[PDB]
Structure 1
Amino acid sequence: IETVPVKLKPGMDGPKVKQWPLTEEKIKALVEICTEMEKEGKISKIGPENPYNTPVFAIKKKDSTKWRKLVDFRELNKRTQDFWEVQLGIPHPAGLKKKKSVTVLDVGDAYFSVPLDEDFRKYTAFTIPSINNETPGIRYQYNVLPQGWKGSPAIFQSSMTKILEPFKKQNPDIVIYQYMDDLYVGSDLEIGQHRTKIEELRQHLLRWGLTTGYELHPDKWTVQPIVLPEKDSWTVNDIQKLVGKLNWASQIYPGIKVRQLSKLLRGTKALTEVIPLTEEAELELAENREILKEPVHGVYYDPSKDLIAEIQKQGQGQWTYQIYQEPFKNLKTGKYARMTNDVKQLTEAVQKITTESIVIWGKTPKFKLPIQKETWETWWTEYWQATWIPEWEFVNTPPLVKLWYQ
Structure 2
Amino acid sequence: ETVPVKLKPGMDGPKVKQWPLTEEKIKALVEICTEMEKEGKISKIGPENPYNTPVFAIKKKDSTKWRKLVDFRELNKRTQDFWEVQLGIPHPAGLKKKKSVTVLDVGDAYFSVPLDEDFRKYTAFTIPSINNETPGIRYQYNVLPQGWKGSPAIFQSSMTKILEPFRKQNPDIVIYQYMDDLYVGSDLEIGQHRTKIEELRQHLLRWGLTTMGYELHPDKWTVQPIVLPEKDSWTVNDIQKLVGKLNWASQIYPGIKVRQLCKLLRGTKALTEVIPLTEEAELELAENREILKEPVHGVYYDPSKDLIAEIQKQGQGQWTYQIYQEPFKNLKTGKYARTNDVKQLTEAVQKITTESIVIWGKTPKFKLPIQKETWETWWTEYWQATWIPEWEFVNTPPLVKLWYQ
Q: Deviations over 1:254-281 (max 9, x none)?
A: 3222211121111111110001112222
CA distance in 2, matches of 1:325, 1:29: 39
User: How much does 1:172 deviate?
Assistant: 1.1
Contact 1:314-1:405 at 8 Å conserved across structures: no
User: How much does 1:351 deviate?
Assistant: 0.4
User: How much does 1:286 deviate?
Assistant: 2.0
Residues 1:20 and 2:19 are matched in the alignment:
yes
Q: Deviations over 1:349-401 (max 9, x none)?
A: 01000000101100011111111111111111011000011111111100111
Contact 2:235-2:274 at 8 Å conserved across structures: yes
Contact 1:105-1:214 at 8 Å conserved across structures: no
CA distance in 1, matches of 2:165, 2:33: 34
Contact 2:16-2:53 at 8 Å conserved across structures: yes
User: How much does 1:215 deviate?
Assistant: 2.1
Specify the alignment match of 1:129 in structure 2: 128
User: How much does 1:214 deviate?
Assistant: 4.9
Contact 1:103-1:186 at 8 Å conserved across structures: yes
Specify the alignment match of 1:257 in structure 2: 257
Q: Deviations over 1:106-152 (max 9, x none)?
A: 11101000000110000001011112222111010000000110000
Q: Deviations over 1:49-77 (max 9, x none)?
A: 11100000110123411101110000000
Q: Deviations over 1:323-352 (max 9, x none)?
A: 1111121111011124x2111111010100
Deviates more, 1:281-290 or 1:105-114: 281-290
User: How much does 1:47 deviate?
Assistant: 1.2
Q: Deviations over 1:18-72 (max 9, x none)?
A: 0111111111111110111111110000011111000001101234111011100
Deviates more, 1:289-298 or 1:364-373: 289-298
Local SS of the residue matching 2:57? strand
Contact 1:54-1:71 at 8 Å conserved across structures: yes
CA distance in 1, matches of 2:61, 2:340: 17
RMSD, matched Cα: 1.1
CA distance in 2, matches of 1:167, 1:254: 45
Local SS of the residue matching 1:231? coil
Deviates more, 1:55-64 or 1:122-131: 55-64
Local SS of the residue matching 1:271? coil
CA distance in 2, matches of 1:210, 1:160: 11
User: How much does 1:170 deviate?
Assistant: 1.1
Local SS of the residue matching 1:219? helix
Contact 1:146-1:152 at 8 Å conserved across structures: yes
Q: Deviations over 1:305-329 (max 9, x none)?
A: 1111111111111111111111121
Contact 1:26-1:57 at 8 Å conserved across structures: yes
Paired positions, count? 404
CA distance in 2, matches of 1:294, 1:268: 35
TM-score of the two chains, using structure 1 as the length reference? 0.98
Q: Deviations over 1:188-213 (max 9, x none)?
A: 11111111111111110111112215
Specify the alignment match of 1:99 in structure 2: 98
Percent sequence identity is 100
Runs (5+) with no aligned partner, structure 1: none
CA distance in 2, matches of 1:218, 1:245: 28
Specify the alignment match of 1:392 in structure 2: 391
Contact 2:248-2:403 at 8 Å conserved across structures: no
CA distance in 2, matches of 1:266, 1:301: 41
CA distance in 2, matches of 1:343, 1:248: 29
User: How much does 1:101 deviate?
Assistant: 1.1
Local SS of the residue matching 2:319? strand
Local SS of the residue matching 2:330? coil
Q: Deviations over 1:221-267 (max 9, x none)?
A: 11111110110110010011111111122111232222111211111
Local SS of the residue matching 2:242? helix
Contact 2:254-2:297 at 8 Å conserved across structures: no
Contact 2:353-2:363 at 8 Å conserved across structures: yes
CA distance in 1, matches of 2:39, 2:398: 53
TM-score of the two chains, using structure 2 as the length reference? 0.98
Q: Deviations over 1:172-201 (max 9, x none)?
A: 111111100000011111111111111111
Moved over 3 A (4+): none
